[PDB]
């Protein structure tokens, strides 16, 4: 993953990316989802958007990291992809995870 080039963002928070290989953990969780371009800066521990509060709240004690890449070829039509939806209205903020 680290040596790939299609990835647009690869910042890591608790662990440096150069020495990811030599570290053993109990479990690895991969959360996958699609968002828009301007909204990708909100996936970090501590944010105040509509995705960090109503869709994908992250804990402040985060240790993995986030990998985002543009996919305009797969998810696009000359009309629109109305199959991707987001939570716009809620009554309270989501708890982490």
């Amino acid at each position, epitope marked *: 993953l680290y040596n790939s080039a299609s990835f647009s963002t690869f910042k890591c928070y608790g662990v440096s990316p150069t020495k990811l290989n030599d570290l053993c953990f109990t479990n690895v969780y991969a959360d996958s989802f699609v968002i828009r371009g301007d909204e990708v800066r909100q996936i970090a521990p501590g944010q*105040t*958007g*509509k995705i960090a*509060d109503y869709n994908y709240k992250l804990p402040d004690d985060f240790t993995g990291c986030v990998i985002a890449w543009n996919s305009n070829n797969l998810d696009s039509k000359v009309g*629109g992809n109305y199959n991707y939806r987001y939570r*716009l209205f809620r*009554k*309270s*903020n989501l708890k982490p995870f």
Partner: antibody
Amino acid sequence: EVQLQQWGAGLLKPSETLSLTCAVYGESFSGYYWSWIRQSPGKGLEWIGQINHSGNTNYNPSLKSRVTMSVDTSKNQFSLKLSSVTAADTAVYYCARELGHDYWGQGTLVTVSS
Amino acid sequence: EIVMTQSPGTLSLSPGERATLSCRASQSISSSYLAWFQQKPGQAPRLLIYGASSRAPGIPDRFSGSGSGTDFTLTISRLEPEDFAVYYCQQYGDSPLTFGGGTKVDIKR
């Protein structure tokens, strides 16, 4: 029916802090979002942010770095703070419920000049 | 930030006529979540039409709305003397609420 009554200072020197308060009567204060809307003669209607009784805040990304919002549940009030105010912040401020569509405050005029 | 742009700000027409106001969004509006607000001098704006088609409770039947995609319009069947005010758009189908520029209506003579 909801009746909204607002107050706050109107004259501010540059680089001061703006504070406004709005009070809610008539219906429940919990389980709702209360919003602040700004109207300028040179820009138009603008949405600043909103807060609910639990303390959760939604902010406009343009003003997110200068806007703070507070709620006092005991007396059913919510307040707006806008720091480092400038002469571009002269406008009429309304307190409304949720997106609007039902009820608005009367409006407070704010003039920032040196 | 879906920027909304409206028809020419000032338009003049004699009373007892029809009025059409245009509204364009830089991007598509989800589920036709567009609202029209009316503001008179000295008062807060009042909602007239929600969902780009419906009519709010207590609103007269002479106000109608029609549109989709990125094009919407408001129609007033007959202009009573009290119908002269400023009209604004609002999109509530995205994250930050955005209002339009505003359109004024005058009295022709």
